[PDB]
Amino acid sequence: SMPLTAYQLRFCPARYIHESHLPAVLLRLLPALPRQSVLNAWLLEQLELDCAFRMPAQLGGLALYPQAALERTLGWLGALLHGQALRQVQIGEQGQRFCLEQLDLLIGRWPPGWQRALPPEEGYFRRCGLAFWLAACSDADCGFSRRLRLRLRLAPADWTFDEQRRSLARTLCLKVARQASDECFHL
């Protein structure tokens, strides 16, 4: 249940990167070597991962969650963004219920493009919620955003928030998170 530290987030990308993202050769080279200082540095190089980067204000910096809470928080969020589509037809009972019951008890009316239609590959909602999370902290340095993205495997025009909607997106994010895992909401 242990979180990551700013140091490990800034300098130890191999502590939290998903094998999905390793450069092919290193994936191929990966088979040995069970979190090692040279790979951390070599990963920061192969990807221009600026170690000069600010953590998005007010807890946007969820790049430090334990993986489990991270995947839960973003899954609940991606599900919620498909709430309406889902009323018209279960990754955690707690989360299934959250999406159906709280859809209209969170941010009032749903801004015009926030709710989306359904098609779904595996992990689809986690990626949706992650896309939404980054869009809510949009000034995020390529160093922050690129590192959060690395914690999951493999955005709609109406999510380029340019107004009060951005301030409403941050609020939805924080509320979904406050319920999706209270354990690690202190971040």
Contacts with Cl ion, residue ranges (CB under 5 A) = 92, 94
Using Cβ positions, the residue closest to Cl ion within the complex turns out to be 92
Question: Is 14 within 8 Å of 44 (Cβ atoms)?
Answer: no
Instruction: Round to whole Å and give the CA distance between 24 and 10.
Output: 23
Query: Of 10 and 72, which has the nearer Cβ to Cl ion?
Result: 72
Query: Of 94 and 160, which has the nearer Cβ to Cl ion?
Result: 94
Shortest separation between residue 106's beta carbon and Cl ion, angstroms:
19
Query: Of 126 and 147, which has the nearer Cβ to Cl ion?
Result: 126
Shortest separation between residue 95's beta carbon and Cl ion, angstroms:
6
Query: Of 60 and 95, which has the nearer Cβ to Cl ion?
Result: 95
Shortest separation between residue 153's beta carbon and Cl ion, angstroms:
21
Shortest separation between residue 164's beta carbon and Cl ion, angstroms:
33
Shortest separation between residue 79's beta carbon and Cl ion, angstroms:
12
Query: Of 122 and 163, which has the nearer Cβ to Cl ion?
Result: 122
Using H for helix, E for strand and C for coil, what is the string for the chain? CCCCCHHHHHHCHHHCCCHHHCCHHHHHHCCCCCCCHHHHHHHHHHCCCCCCCCCCCCCCCCCCCCHHHHHHHHHHHHHHCCHHHHHCCCCCHHHHHHHHHCCCCCCCCCCCCCCCCCCCCCCHHHHHHHHHHHHHCCCCCHHHHHHHHCCCCCCCHHHCCCCHHHHHHHHHHHHHHHHHCCCCCCC
What contacts 45, CB < 8 A, 6 or more positions away?
none
Instruction: Round to whole Å and give the CA distance between 67 and 6.
Output: 15
Shortest separation between residue 94's beta carbon and Cl ion, angstroms:
4
Query: Of 58 and 94, which has the nearer Cβ to Cl ion?
Result: 94
